[PDB]
Subunit: 28 residues, 3 copies
Amino acid sequence: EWEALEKKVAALESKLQALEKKHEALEH
Amino acid sequence: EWEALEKKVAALESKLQALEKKHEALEHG
Amino acid sequence: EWEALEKKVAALESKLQALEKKHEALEHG
Ligand SMILES: [Cl-]
Ligand SMILES: [Hg+2]
Ligand code: NA
Ligand SMILES: [Zn+2]
Ligand SMILES: [Zn+2]
Ligand SMILES: [Zn+2]
């Protein structure tokens, strides 16, 4: 249970670092 | 405490999937 | 480690809010 939520939070972190990168491509 | 932290991340995950779909639109889908 | 994990999700939540403001600014704009 503990590990699962740590795994989840790390995965959301990476998904978020992915969106910030996609967001960078549109900006000049 | 645990149940609150779980619902928080579940809601942030939902908010992220919506931001993902916005990037799928701009990409020109 | 509640303190360490709650720190992580708070920073995650703010980065998500920041990005949500930016997509909102795009529609207006
Ligand atoms: Cl975004
Ligand atoms: Hg989390
Ligand atoms: Na930018
Ligand atoms: Zn974006
Ligand atoms: Zn707590
Ligand atoms: Zn430990």
